[PDB]
Ligand SMILES: Nc1nc2c(ncn2[C@@H]2O[C@H](COP(=O)(O)OP(=O)(O)NP(=O)(O)O)[C@@H](O)[C@H]2O)c(=O)[nH]1
Ligand SMILES: CCCCCC
Ligand SMILES: CCCCCC
């Protein structure tokens with residue numbers, strides 16, 4: 001049909017797995033089990049096109065990060081996730097983007113910046129800060145909550161729409 005390989009990256013605990021599971025399985029994972037490397041597949045209609053999403057959920061914990069680069073290499077677009085209550089995860093985004101560019105050997109890779117956990121109130125990253133970072137990269141910024149499902153479909157579908165502009 002039409003396949004899009006999406007890779008979700010970002011610091012440990014920011015909600016990469018919760019986001020992916022909300023999209024694919026329609027429930028919220030409350031517990032924290034660090035990921036090594038997991039894959040999901042779903043057929044969905046996006047803007048009138050039937051397509052197959054292959055989503056790679058990657059490790060954010062350094063200790064679990066072995067060989068992540070080898071998984072990142074096959075990606076067609078990347079969700080770069082931080083949590084709005086985790087300033088360090090936002091600062092880390094630069095390093096994840098740089099890794100993406102290294103493994104893709106390109107400065108032109110479809111990406112979306114995602115600020116997750118927007119249901120929480122201990123915000124330390126303001127929307128405008130993230131919008132500015134995204135603007136510097138030439139990509140959209142979207143806020144999500146894996147818990148309430150706010151923005152979850154939007155983030156992944158926006159990434160598909162970015163891949164289509166490549
Ligand atoms: N309130 C709230 N909690 C969230 C949200 N997303 C994830 N969490 C919580 O944050 C914790 C970590 O989520 P998880 O998805 O495992 O993070 P991760 O980025 O996949 N971690 P890792 O890189 O180690 O695999 C879990 O307790 C999960 O319930 C969110 O949008 N809101
Ligand atoms: C480490 C954060 C800096 C952002 C650079 C694009
Ligand atoms: C501090 C996170 C950087 C990730 C690059 C492998």
Ligand SMILES: [Ca+2]
Nearest residue numbers: 027028029030
């Ligand atoms: Ca649950």
Ligand SMILES: [Ca+2]
Nearest residue numbers: 102103104105
């Ligand atoms: Ca390389």
Ligand SMILES: [Ca+2]
Nearest residue numbers: 102103104105
């Ligand atoms: Ca390469």
Ligand SMILES: [Mg+2]
Nearest residue numbers: 016017034035
């Ligand atoms: Mg995970």
